[PDB]
Amino acid sequence: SMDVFWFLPTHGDGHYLGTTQGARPVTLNYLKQVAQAADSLGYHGVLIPTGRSCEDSWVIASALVPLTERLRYLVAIRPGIISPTVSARMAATLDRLSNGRLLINVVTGGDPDENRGDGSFLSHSERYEVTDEFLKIWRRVLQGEAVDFEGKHLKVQNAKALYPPVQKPYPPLYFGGSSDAAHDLAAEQVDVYLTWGEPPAAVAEKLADVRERAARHGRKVKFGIRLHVIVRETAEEAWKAADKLIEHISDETIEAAQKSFSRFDSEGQRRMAALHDGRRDNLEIAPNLWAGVGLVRGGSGTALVGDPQQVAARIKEYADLGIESFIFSGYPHLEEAYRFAELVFPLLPEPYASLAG
Amino acid sequence: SMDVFWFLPTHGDGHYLGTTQGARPVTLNYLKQVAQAADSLGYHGVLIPTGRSCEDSWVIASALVPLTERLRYLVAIRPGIISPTVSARMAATLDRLSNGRLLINVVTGGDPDENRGDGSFLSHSERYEVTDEFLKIWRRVLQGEAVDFEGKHLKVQNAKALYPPVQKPYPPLYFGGSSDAAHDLAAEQVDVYLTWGEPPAAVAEKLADVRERAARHGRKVKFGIRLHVIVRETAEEAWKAADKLIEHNLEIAPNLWAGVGLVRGGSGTALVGDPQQVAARIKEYADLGIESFIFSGYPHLEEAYRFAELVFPLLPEPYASLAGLTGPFGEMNDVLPA
Amino acid sequence: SMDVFWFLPTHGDGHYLGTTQGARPVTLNYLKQVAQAADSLGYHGVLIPTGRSCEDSWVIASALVPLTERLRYLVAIRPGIISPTVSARMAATLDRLSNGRLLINVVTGGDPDENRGDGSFLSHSERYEVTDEFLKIWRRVLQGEAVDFEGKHLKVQNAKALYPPVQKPYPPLYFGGSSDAAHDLAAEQVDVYLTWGEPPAAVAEKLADVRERAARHGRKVKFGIRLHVIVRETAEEAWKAADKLIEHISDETIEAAQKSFSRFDSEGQRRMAALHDGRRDNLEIAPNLWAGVGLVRGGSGTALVGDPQQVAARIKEYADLGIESFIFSGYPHLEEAYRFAELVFPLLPEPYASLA
Amino acid sequence: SMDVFWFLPTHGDGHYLGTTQGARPVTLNYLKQVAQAADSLGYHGVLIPTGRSCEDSWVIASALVPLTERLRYLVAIRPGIISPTVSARMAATLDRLSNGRLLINVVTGGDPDENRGDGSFLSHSERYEVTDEFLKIWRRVLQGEAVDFEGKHLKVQNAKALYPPVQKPYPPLYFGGSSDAAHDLAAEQVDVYLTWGEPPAAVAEKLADVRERAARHGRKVKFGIRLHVIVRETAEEAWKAADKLIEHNLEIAPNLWAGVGLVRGGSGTALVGDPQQVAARIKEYADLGIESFIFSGYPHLEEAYRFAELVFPLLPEPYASLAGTNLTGPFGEMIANDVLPA
Ligand SMILES: Cc1cc2nc3c(=O)[nH]c(=O)nc-3n(C[C@H](O)[C@H](O)[C@H](O)COP(=O)(O)O)c2cc1C
Ligand SMILES: Cc1cc2nc3c(=O)[nH]c(=O)nc-3n(C[C@H](O)[C@H](O)[C@H](O)COP(=O)(O)O)c2cc1C
Numbered sequence A: 001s002m003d004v005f006w007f008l009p010t011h012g013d014g015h016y017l018g019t020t021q022g023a024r025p026v027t028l029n030y031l032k033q034v035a036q037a038a039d040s041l042g043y044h045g046v047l048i049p050t051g052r053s054c055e056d057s058w059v060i061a062s063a064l065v066p067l068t069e070r071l072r073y074l075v076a077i078r079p080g081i082i083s084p085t086v087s088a089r090m091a092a093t094l095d096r097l098s099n100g101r102l103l104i105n106v107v108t109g110g111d112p113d114e115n116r117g118d119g120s121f122l123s124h125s126e127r128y129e130v131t132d133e134f135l136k137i138w139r140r141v142l143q144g145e146a147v148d149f150e151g152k153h154l155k156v157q158n159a160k161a162l163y164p165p166v167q168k169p170y171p172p173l174y175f176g177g178s179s180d181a182a183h184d185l186a187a188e189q190v191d192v193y194l195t196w197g198e199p200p201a202a203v204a205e206k207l208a209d210v211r212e213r214a215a216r217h218g219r220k221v222k223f224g225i226r227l228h229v230i231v232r233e234t235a236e237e238a239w240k241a242a243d244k245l246i247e248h249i250s251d252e253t254i255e256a257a258q259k260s261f262s263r264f265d266s267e268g269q270r271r272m273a274a275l276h277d278g279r280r281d282n283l284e285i286a287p288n289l290w291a292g293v294g295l296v297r298g299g300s301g302t303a304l305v306g307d308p309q310q311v312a313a314r315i316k317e318y319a320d321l322g323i324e325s326f327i328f329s330g331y332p333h334l335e336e337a338y339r340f341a342e343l344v345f346p347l348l349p350e351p352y353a354s355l356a357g
Numbered sequence B: 001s002m003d004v005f006w007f008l009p010t011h012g013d014g015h016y017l018g019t020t021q022g023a024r025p026v027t028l029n030y031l032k033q034v035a036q037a038a039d040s041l042g043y044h045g046v047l048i049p050t051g052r053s054c055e056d057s058w059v060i061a062s063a064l065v066p067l068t069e070r071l072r073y074l075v076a077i078r079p080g081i082i083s084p085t086v087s088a089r090m091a092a093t094l095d096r097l098s099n100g101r102l103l104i105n106v107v108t109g110g111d112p113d114e115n116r117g118d119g120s121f122l123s124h125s126e127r128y129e130v131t132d133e134f135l136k137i138w139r140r141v142l143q144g145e146a147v148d149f150e151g152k153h154l155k156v157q158n159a160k161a162l163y164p165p166v167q168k169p170y171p172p173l174y175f176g177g178s179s180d181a182a183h184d185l186a187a188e189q190v191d192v193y194l195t196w197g198e199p200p201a202a203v204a205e206k207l208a209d210v211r212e213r214a215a216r217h218g219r220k221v222k223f224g225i226r227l228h229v230i231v232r233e234t235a236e237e238a239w240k241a242a243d244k245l246i247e248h249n250l251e252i253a254p255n256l257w258a259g260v261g262l263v264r265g266g267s268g269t270a271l272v273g274d275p276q277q278v279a280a281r282i283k284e285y286a287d288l289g290i291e292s293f294i295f296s297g298y299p300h301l302e303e304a305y306r307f308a309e310l311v312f313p314l315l316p317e318p319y320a321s322l323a324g325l326t327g328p329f330g331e332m333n334d335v336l337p338a
Numbered sequence C: 001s002m003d004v005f006w007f008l009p010t011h012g013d014g015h016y017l018g019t020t021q022g023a024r025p026v027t028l029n030y031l032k033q034v035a036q037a038a039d040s041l042g043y044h045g046v047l048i049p050t051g052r053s054c055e056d057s058w059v060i061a062s063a064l065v066p067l068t069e070r071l072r073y074l075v076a077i078r079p080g081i082i083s084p085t086v087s088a089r090m091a092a093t094l095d096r097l098s099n100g101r102l103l104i105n106v107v108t109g110g111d112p113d114e115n116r117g118d119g120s121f122l123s124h125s126e127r128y129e130v131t132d133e134f135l136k137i138w139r140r141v142l143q144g145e146a147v148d149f150e151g152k153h154l155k156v157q158n159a160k161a162l163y164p165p166v167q168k169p170y171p172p173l174y175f176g177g178s179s180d181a182a183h184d185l186a187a188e189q190v191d192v193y194l195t196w197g198e199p200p201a202a203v204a205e206k207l208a209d210v211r212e213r214a215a216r217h218g219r220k221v222k223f224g225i226r227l228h229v230i231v232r233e234t235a236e237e238a239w240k241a242a243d244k245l246i247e248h249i250s251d252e253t254i255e256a257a258q259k260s261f262s263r264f265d266s267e268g269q270r271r272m273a274a275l276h277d278g279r280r281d282n283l284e285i286a287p288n289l290w291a292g293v294g295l296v297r298g299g300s301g302t303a304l305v306g307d308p309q310q311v312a313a314r315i316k317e318y319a320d321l322g323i324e325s326f327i328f329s330g331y332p333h334l335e336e337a338y339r340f341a342e343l344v345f346p347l348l349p350e351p352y353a354s355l356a
Numbered sequence D: 001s002m003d004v005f006w007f008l009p010t011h012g013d014g015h016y017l018g019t020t021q022g023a024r025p026v027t028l029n030y031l032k033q034v035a036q037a038a039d040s041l042g043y044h045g046v047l048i049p050t051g052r053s054c055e056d057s058w059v060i061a062s063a064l065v066p067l068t069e070r071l072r073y074l075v076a077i078r079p080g081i082i083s084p085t086v087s088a089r090m091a092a093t094l095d096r097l098s099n100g101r102l103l104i105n106v107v108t109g110g111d112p113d114e115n116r117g118d119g120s121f122l123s124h125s126e127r128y129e130v131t132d133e134f135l136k137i138w139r140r141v142l143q144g145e146a147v148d149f150e151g152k153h154l155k156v157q158n159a160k161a162l163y164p165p166v167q168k169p170y171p172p173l174y175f176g177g178s179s180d181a182a183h184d185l186a187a188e189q190v191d192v193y194l195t196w197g198e199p200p201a202a203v204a205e206k207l208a209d210v211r212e213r214a215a216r217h218g219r220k221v222k223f224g225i226r227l228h229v230i231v232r233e234t235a236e237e238a239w240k241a242a243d244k245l246i247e248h249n250l251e252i253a254p255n256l257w258a259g260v261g262l263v264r265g266g267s268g269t270a271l272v273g274d275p276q277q278v279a280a281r282i283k284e285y286a287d288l289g290i291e292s293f294i295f296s297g298y299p300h301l302e303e304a305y306r307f308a309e310l311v312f313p314l315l316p317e318p319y320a321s322l323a324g325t326n327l328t329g330p331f332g333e334m335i336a337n338d339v340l341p342a
C-alpha cells in the first residue's frame, strides 16, 4: 500500500529559491492548474500548508474541491486560534461538499512570534495541552455527540455539529512533530504520523518511538514522510538542477532565514536545520538526499535528487520502514508534478504503476 | 444607488415552512444552482447565514467563488470563536481569489446555548467588547500594519496579514444589531448597518439613531434591510401563496406580512403583493436612506428568478436594464416571436 | 426499465407561448442552469433539438459536458448536410470527452424551405436514402473499419475514425418519424424509436408497425415517447396552468403557424398538427392529454396535464405498450424540471423513486 | 498591434518527436490544462488543428469555452464536408456562448486521401472553388441576409442564420495557403492571411503578393505567421533541447531550425535561442506587417509557461505587462514565515 501526495504552493512558487527572479504568482488560476494536474495525473491528494506565510488553507481547499473529481485535500487545522466546535463544522461541511475527500493535518505551530501575532501566548508544553483537549472535542462532536468538556484550556457545553461528515468516524487525522509531547499526542489520537525528510536512520528511530507509544495505548498508527524531489532522466541533470535551484541565494539571505529559524520553538524544525546550518559545500547529507532546499525555505528542507531509478530506490527504503504516505513537491510545482508522475510513477507500486497511460 | 441581494439557504430550503413536505436538501449542487442563478440574473450578491443550523459559511462561499463571475458573497465572521489575525487572513485569501467580491457581515451571536457550545462564555456587554477589539485588530492588519494590541479580551503582538486584499482598505463591513452597544459599534467601525423588515416608521427611527451617532464620529454609514418576498403577477396570487406557505392577523403593515416570523427562518417579515406594490414598498424604504436590500423566497432558486423578472424592471438602474445577445426571443421554425 | 429525459430549450424559453411576454433569453448561463439541474435531479439525459430555429446542438452539448457528471446528452445529427465521416469523428470526440454520455438523435428534416436553405434539394424518399447510406457509413467507421462505400447519394473511400468511441459499438441511435420510409429506417438501423405524444391507441399501432418491420430484419428496437408535462399538486391547478400558458396566443399567429406546417413535408408533423386543426375549444384529446402546445409549437404538441397520480398513470399506460424512454418538458424549463422531479419521480419505478 | 497565440495539441503531445517515449495522451483534462494555461498567462488565443489525426476541433473548443474567460479559439472550418448554412450557425452559436471569442481558420485540405475519406473527390482548383462559394454564403448569412446562391459547386435557397453573432460582421477569417488560387481567395474574402515559418525573405515576398491582389480589390488584409519555438534562458540549453527533441545541417536561417519538419508535427520550422534572440526574430517578422503569431512547443503545457515567462516581457504591449493579475504581495516562495523574497 502507498499513497503519493503532491503540494499546493500557497507560500509562492518559482524556478529559484530566495530570489524573486523567475517567480510565479499564486492566483486562483494557477492553484487550479496544480490541483487539476494532480487530479488528472492520479495523485492521491495534495497537502495544503498553513501559517502566516500562506494563504488560508481552508479557503484554498474549499475553492478547489468543486474543480476536482478524485483528488483529496490534506488541510491543516491549528488548535488554539479557533473554536474546536467551529473547526469541526468546517471539517464536516468541506468533507460533505467533497464527498469524503477531506484529510486533516493537525498543526501546533512552532513559531512563537507568529503565535503571538495570532493571540496565543503559550509555551511548547501548553500548546500540546490545548491540542490534546482540542482533538478530544473535535473527534467527539463529529461523531454526533453533544459534548460537555471542561479542561485546563478548552471548555464547551452542549457542543454539537449538526451535519455529520462523510468519512467515519471523522476525516483522517494526519500529524507531524518530533518532540515528546508530539509523539505522545500522535500515539494517542491521530491516525497517521508525518515526519520530514530526515535520513532513513533518523526516521526509523522516530517511527519506532511512535510505534512503541501507540502500542502502549492499544493503537496502531500509519506513517508518512514529507519530501521535496528534483528528479530528471539522468543523475547529472538532476544535480545540475539542484545547483541551479539555489544559484541566486546570497549569503545574507541564508543568514536572515537561519536567524529566524533559531527563534522557532519547534523540535521538528530544529532537526531539519541541524542538517544544513548554512553550509553550501557537501549538501548531499545521504545517498540521493540533498539538503539545499532548507537553506531558505521553512518546514521541509531536503529533496531526493537523482534519476528515476535512484529516486524510486530511496522510496523503497522509507517504505520498508513502514512509511505508506509520501508527500512530494518540486519547483515549479506544476511542471514537476508532471515530471515525477511520468518518471517515477511507473516505478512505484499499484495503482501508480498503471496510471502512466 | 441600490444593491439588491439574494440569500443562500445554507440552513435548508423547501416549498413550505414548518413541515418537511416538499423540503429541498442543501447540497453542493443546489447551492451552485442558487448562486449561479443570482450571478447570471444580475443580483449584487448573496447573504450567507451562519450558526449551528447552517453549513460553514466560509467553506460554501469559497467553493462558489470560482463558479461565479460577478456575484458578491456576504460572509459572516464571528468574534470570540476565532483569532482576529487568522480571520483577516481568511478574508484576504477569499477576497483575492474572488477579485474583490467578498463582503463581511459582523455577527456577535445572540444564542447563549450555541455560544457555550462553541466555548464562549461571555455576557451581552462582553460580547460587543470582543467585537470592538476584534474589528480594530482585523481592520488594521488588513491595511498592512504590524499590529500590537492588548485589550480587555484580545491581545496580539506582531500581528501581520502578509497578503493584501483586493478591496481597499478592507472588504466592506456589514453589521446588524438593535441594542445601544450595537448602534455605537455600527456608527464607529462598520460600513453598512443592517436592519430587519420593520414597518417604515420603525426603520426610520433606528436609522436616525445610527445616523446621529455616526456624525459624532465624523463618519457616515450606509443602510440595508433584510426582507422575505412573495411577489406574483397579481395581488391575489401573492396572498394565496403566502397562505399556502404556512398552511401546515399577520399583515402588520401595507403589504408587509409577518407570517415568515412564525418559525425560525431567514427573517420575520415579508413583502407580499404584485410587482407594483412590492416596488412601492421598496421605494419607501429607499427614501429613508436604505441602499442595500437582502431578499429571499421559498424556494430560493425559483423565487430568485421570480423577483428578478417581475421587480427588476421597476427598480432603478442597473436593475432596470438587466431585464432582457439578440435574435429570437422565446420559443420560435421560421416565424419569430413578436 | 425506464429512462426519463428532460429538454434543453434551445429555441427559447418563457412562461407563455406565442408572445414575448414573460420570455427568457437562452444564454450559456441559463443552459448551464437547466443542464446542471437535470444532472443533479437525476434525469437520465436531455434532448437537444436541432434546426434553423435552434442554436447548434453540437456546440451546446459539448459546452455543457464538462459542467455535468452523470447527465447524458441526446444530440441530433442531420444526414445530407454534413459528411458521414466527419459526423462520426464529432460523435467519437464528444462521447470520449463525456466518458460515454452521448446519445444520437437521427434527424432527416421535414421542412423543405429549411432544407433548401441548407443546400439540400431532395424529395422525401430521397432524404431517407441519404440517411440510409449515411448511417451505414457512420456506424461502420465508428467500429474501426476503413470504409469504402459508393451509393446513390454518398461515396467514401478509406473513411477512418482514428479515435474509437467509448460506448460500443457506437453511441445509441435514437430516431423519430412517422412516414413509411421512417419506419423502415428505424426498423433497420436505429436502437430506439421515438414518437410524439399521441393518444395510447394511436401510439400502440405505431409501435406494432415498427416491431413488425424490425422482426423482418431480425432486429428488436426499443421505444420512447416525447411529451410536454404540466403537473401540479392538484388537478385543478394543473388545468389552470395549462389554460394560462396559451392566454396570449393570437388567432393570426395560429393560422400563420399552421400555414407553415401545411408546407411541412413530414408525416410526424402532419399527424401532430391534425390533432387540433387550430380549433381552440375542447383541447383535451384524451384523459389528461392536452394538445394546447401544438397551437404554435412544432414537434411535440401534447402534454400530460393533471395531479401527480394522473400524470404517473398516463406514464404507466405508455410503458405498458413497450415505451421505455420518456422525454418531458415544461415552461419554463428550469422550474418545471424541479417540479416534475419532485412530484412525479417518487411515483415512478426505480431509480427515480429513491432519488428524492 | 500584436496577437500571440498558443497551440492545442489535439493530434497528440509529448516530449519527443517520432517515438512514443515521453508521450502524453490527449484527454479532456489535459486539453483543459493547456487551454486554461494560455487563458491565465494572457495569450490572445489558441489555434486548434483539424484533420483525421485530430479530435474534432468544434467539440473541443466548445467544451473549453465555459472553462476560460478571455482566451480566444481559432477553430478550423473545412468547406466541402459541411453545409455552409450549418457551419455559420455553428460559428454563431460558439461566438455567442463565448461572447465574441471565436476565430475561424479556413482550411481547404491538401491531402487527397483524407479528402476522399470524407467524401470529397475534388481537384486542387476545384477545392478552392468550393471554398470561394462557401465563404461567400458563410459571410452573407451571418450578416442577417436571406441568401440565394447557385454556383458551380454549392447551391442554397433562402439560407438564413436566425441567431446573429457577437462579432460584426462575422468572426474574423484566418486563412493559409501558398498556391495562386489561395492568394487570390485570401486577398478577396479573408481577414488574416497565415503562412508557415519560412525565412524572413520568403515571407516578405509572399505577403507582398497577397497585398497587391488585395489592393486591386480595394481591401487590406492583416498577416500572421505560424512557428514552433524552443526558447530557454541560454542559447546553449536551447540547442541542447532541440537536439534532444529528435534523438529518436538543419539551421536554415538565423535562429530558424527545421527539425520539426522531419515528422508530421504542427509546422516545420522553429525559433531556437535565448530570449533576446527569439524576440529579435519576432521583431523581424513584425516589421514586415505580421501582427498575429501562433507559437507552440513540446510539451505544450510546460512550454506555454516557458515562452510566456521568458518572451512576453520582451514583446510589445499588452504582453510586456502581462508577466507581472491584480494581486500583490509575496512574489515567490516566502523565506521562513516573515521574510519577503529578495
Ligand atoms: C508534514 C508536516 C507538515 C507540516 N505543516 C505545517 C504547516 O502547514 N504549518 C505549520 O505551521 N507547521 C507545520 N508543520 C510543523 C508542525 O505541525 C509543528 O508546527 C511543529 O513541528 C512543532 O512541533 P514540535 O515542536 O513537536 O516538533 C508540519 C510538520 C510536518 C511534519
Ligand atoms: C422525438 C422526436 C424528435 C425530433 N426532433 C427533431 C429535430 O430536432 N429537428 C427536426 O427537424 N426534426 C425532428 N423530428 C422530426 C423527424 O425526425 C423528421 O426530421 C421529420 O419530421 C420527417 O420525418 P417523417 O416524414 O417520417 O415524420 C423529431 C421527431 C421526434 C419523434
Ligand SMILES: Cc1cc2nc3c(=O)[nH]c(=O)nc-3n(C[C@H](O)[C@H](O)[C@H](O)COP(=O)(O)O)c2cc1C
Residues within 6 Å of the ligand: D048, D049, D050, D051, D076, D106, D107, D108, D109, D110, D111, D175, D176, D177, D178, D179, D182, D194, D195, D196, D226
Ligand atoms: C497556419 C496554418 C494552419 C493550417 N492548419 C491546417 C489544419 O489544421 N489542417 C489542414 O488540413 N491544413 C492546414 N493548413 C494547410 C492549408 O489549410 C491548406 O490545406 C494547404 O496550405 C494546402 O493549400 P495550398 O496548395 O494553397 O498550399 C494550415 C496552413 C496554415 C498556414
